[PDB]
Amino acid sequence: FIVNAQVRSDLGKGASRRLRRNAGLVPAVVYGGDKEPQSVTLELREIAKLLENEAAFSHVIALNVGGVKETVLIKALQRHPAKGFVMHADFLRVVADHKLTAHVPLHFINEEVAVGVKQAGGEISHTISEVEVSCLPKDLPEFIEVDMAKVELGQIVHLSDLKAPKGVELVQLAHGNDLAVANIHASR
Amino acid sequence: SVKKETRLRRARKARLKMRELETVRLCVYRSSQHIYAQVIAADGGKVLASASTLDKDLREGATGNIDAAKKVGQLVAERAKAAGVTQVAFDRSGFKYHGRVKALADAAREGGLEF
Amino acid sequence: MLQPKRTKFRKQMTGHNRGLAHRGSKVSFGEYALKATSRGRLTARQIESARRALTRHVKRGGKIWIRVFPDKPVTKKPLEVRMGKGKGGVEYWVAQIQPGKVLYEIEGVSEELAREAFALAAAKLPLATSFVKRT
Amino acid sequence: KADIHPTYEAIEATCSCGNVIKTRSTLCKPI
Amino acid sequence: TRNGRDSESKRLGVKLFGGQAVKAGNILVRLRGTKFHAGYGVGLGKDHTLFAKVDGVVKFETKGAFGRKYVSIVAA
Amino acid sequence: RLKELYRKEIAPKLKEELQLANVMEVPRVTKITLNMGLGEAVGDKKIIENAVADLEKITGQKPVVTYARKSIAGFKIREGWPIGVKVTLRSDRMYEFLDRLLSISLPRVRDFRGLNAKSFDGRGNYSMGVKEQIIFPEIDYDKIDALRGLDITLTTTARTDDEGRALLRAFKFP
RNA sequence: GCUUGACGAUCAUAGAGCGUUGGAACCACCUGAUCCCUUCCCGAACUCAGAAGUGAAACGACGCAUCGCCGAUGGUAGUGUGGGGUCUCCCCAUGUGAGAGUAGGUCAUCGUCAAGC
RNA sequence: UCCUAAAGAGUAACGGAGGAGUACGAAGGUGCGCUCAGACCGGUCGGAAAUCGGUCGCAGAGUAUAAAGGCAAAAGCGCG
Ligand SMILES: [Mg+2]
Ligand SMILES: [Mg+2]
Ligand SMILES: [Mg+2]
Ligand SMILES: [Mg+2]
Ligand SMILES: [Mg+2]
């Protein structure tokens, strides 16, 4: 996980569309805690390798603006709706001590053999994914493992069932709700 | 409370119509112990004359009677005429003009001040 | 077919079909989807020709969502009728599609059973629809 | 006001005015 | 069943914009029920029609609680 | 005089009893409302002036009549427009009317329990329905009509209804 | 500047919720209703005569961003004039540039006197 | 009165939707007072619902008469 950048001292609409067809570039910004926001050009080819990676969204990425180095986490992807490709990136500086909410993928690791599958009518319907995080950046949750190999038929899974290991909270439990996660039901 | 904001709801009609006419307002404030009176200039935020009971020549433990309030409105026209103030209005501030309110506003008409 | 139960009015203007689709272009429920890459409008009988194509190429399970709903009534004058004696009656109902909008979603199936199932539903729709995945 | 009518000759009389009109003046509870 | 029958368009609107100079009894706003309230030196007639009473320059300021629109005229 | 029974025995007792810090936290009775429901016989035009004269004697105070506020066609029309008769009792006629209850308005009921201890609102108010107008001094039996549906509703300065119980068990008749 | 009252200035970054805390000056509940006066019934409210008690309630201050409310930068939508194209829709040059969302903010700031330091 | 009507006025169609050809001597004036709907808990013959008490409200009620624009100095409600 490494990517290198440039400065982009040309703003607007007209100068921001000539980047995408002449040079194949993608705009970006770097805004953080203690500094100013700083715009940036990146290439469409180099973000394509990172966006193809699995856990690159919930992970720290280094950035070479010039020779300037910074540990950068990504929280946005504006994306072209019609054809489908990346537009400007809008990522974030990482301070060594700050609360830092982000989003984390799920896996549902062990559902080959379940009580609801092998005994009763076998269906497992994943409702939610991309559950958030609120954790210090010293420990990065790349993913959360959920196990539905023992949950029987007719039972659902809340957010209190799966856990958040080693100093990780859940924003939805900080509100007065507990969202359902996965169901096991009967096929038609 | 409950009583305090209901008489504030009763007071804002006449207090807002005296604002539009730009008249030197004579306000009042009754308590269960003693009675205030102020003359506020034509901007709502400037007090010209103000006589009370809590001054250091009148406190005697008998404030809270109708006879105590006659001297309050008596000794306030002498400070407004010393400030050169006539042509005033009388906001009763949600108080029913019957008892200690009305008796103070008769001492103003006696002491040369006129409405 | 799919149409509102009751309506606050009876007839509606024509309008236009402009812009792209910024909300509606993200897969939310399923893990595979058939999004539309050309603008048009769907006439609520094509939806049932495309629904009954996906719901017999699976026959085993999965779950189907229908993201789009027709609510715009359209008119049609009868024949041998001159123009200008009012406005014609409502014959059918129309949804309006613009590039990027997701039409159907599927989950709980294979990555290539579904790929050859949206081929059946795309041959009933008058639009050029592509194949996309959940991210 | 003055529109109301008291019967204070018996209202302000004795509650234990015998058990011959009140029918119970040594106990109030029948239970 | 058949439906033509519109009406004849009473010519409402706001006259005398934000920097004018007014006479004694000009018409400021032909209202339809108090989009604009009676500010400092204006009138508010029968059908809620703002009119002047003194001379000066129109302001169009937003004041106080409820965020209501007060049309005052300023001797400036 | 239950007021002189209140201040001397009940009022010092409850401050230590329910862990009350000062004087002014003690419960007491605010008012008594009755609300004789004449919702039966809407278009009667004969029973209201009877029902006023019924409640006129057992309280010693003139009632007021209560109109309606809708036309609930399933119940009745809005033509028989007065429906209710209500009396609010403040502090002078409170502790004197309260002595008729629980002393001589007990034996003429022919009941089992004088009042249930389960029916409360969440704040600490008690309500009760009395079936007959027979439980009353200075009343006729022959000239009275036995169509008198009467209620008793109590209001207390209680925060929650357990404090209503410790007040009600002092002058009790359950 | 600190204490309490009155009247304003400004209308939520000033709100709500939770917590905490104040007296014998102020204020509030309070005590009575004979005497003013009052209630489509009721001294509840209104009013009068007062200083047994209390700071409970109420009311101010003091804390908490949990709800609310404000809100960047960048990008994007749309659009004036001049030209384009495959022309029921878009694109180029140029001027203009939101809304939504993100980083984060917020437990207000003042003025006039009268009684306190 | 609303929409077509392009954020000043204006603006067509055998274009889409609705109303009027009146009431009122108080339904006018004025002074003085006072707040809605709805939910919910308790309460006798009513009960999904009548009258009463309570909390929650934060105009979702109301406006002689259509819809639009308004209404806490309430333009809404009561009294002399
Ligand atoms: Mg914005
Ligand atoms: Mg126009
Ligand atoms: Mg125009
Ligand atoms: Mg009217
Ligand atoms: Mg008024």
Tab-separated table of N, CA, C and O (backbone and C1' of nucleotides) and ligand atoms in Angstrom, chain H residues 5-11, ligand 2:
chain	number	residue	atom	x	y	z
H	5	A	P	-44.828	26.475	-18.434
H	5	A	O5'	-44.946	27.783	-17.549
H	5	A	C5'	-43.780	28.344	-16.972
H	5	A	C4'	-44.042	29.690	-16.357
H	5	A	C3'	-44.537	29.678	-14.918
H	5	A	O3'	-44.047	30.847	-14.268
H	5	A	C1'	-46.108	30.766	-16.273
H	6	A	P	-42.638	30.872	-13.493
H	6	A	O5'	-41.529	30.622	-14.602
H	6	A	C5'	-40.696	29.475	-14.577
H	6	A	C4'	-39.569	29.615	-15.566
H	6	A	C3'	-38.918	30.990	-15.609
H	6	A	O3'	-37.875	31.121	-14.661
H	6	A	C1'	-39.542	30.352	-17.790
H	7	A	P	-37.342	32.557	-14.203
H	7	A	O5'	-37.579	32.554	-12.636
H	7	A	C5'	-38.878	32.443	-12.083
H	7	A	C4'	-38.902	32.948	-10.667
H	7	A	C3'	-38.374	34.352	-10.485
H	7	A	O3'	-39.300	35.358	-10.839
H	7	A	C1'	-37.339	32.962	-8.917
H	8	G	P	-38.918	36.413	-11.985
H	8	G	O5'	-39.262	37.809	-11.320
H	8	G	C5'	-39.730	37.878	-9.982
H	8	G	C4'	-40.419	39.190	-9.721
H	8	G	C3'	-41.770	39.366	-10.399
H	8	G	O3'	-42.833	38.815	-9.641
H	8	G	C1'	-40.417	41.257	-10.819
H	9	A	P	-44.127	38.205	-10.364
H	9	A	O5'	-44.722	39.419	-11.193
H	9	A	C5'	-45.567	40.367	-10.570
H	9	A	C4'	-46.132	41.356	-11.557
H	9	A	C3'	-47.102	40.833	-12.592
H	9	A	O3'	-48.390	40.590	-12.064
H	9	A	C1'	-45.668	42.469	-13.535
H	10	G	P	-49.273	39.361	-12.596
H	10	G	O5'	-49.296	39.527	-14.177
H	10	G	C5'	-50.243	40.371	-14.812
H	10	G	C4'	-49.908	40.584	-16.265
H	10	G	C3'	-50.191	39.417	-17.198
H	10	G	O3'	-51.538	39.363	-17.639
H	10	G	C1'	-48.007	40.201	-17.573
H	11	U	P	-52.412	38.031	-17.442
H	11	U	O5'	-52.180	37.185	-18.770
H	11	U	C5'	-51.957	37.808	-20.023
H	11	U	C4'	-51.135	36.940	-20.945
H	11	U	C3'	-51.382	35.447	-20.860
H	11	U	O3'	-52.523	35.057	-21.601
H	11	U	C1'	-49.055	35.876	-20.929
I	2	MG	MG	-44.396	35.296	-12.342
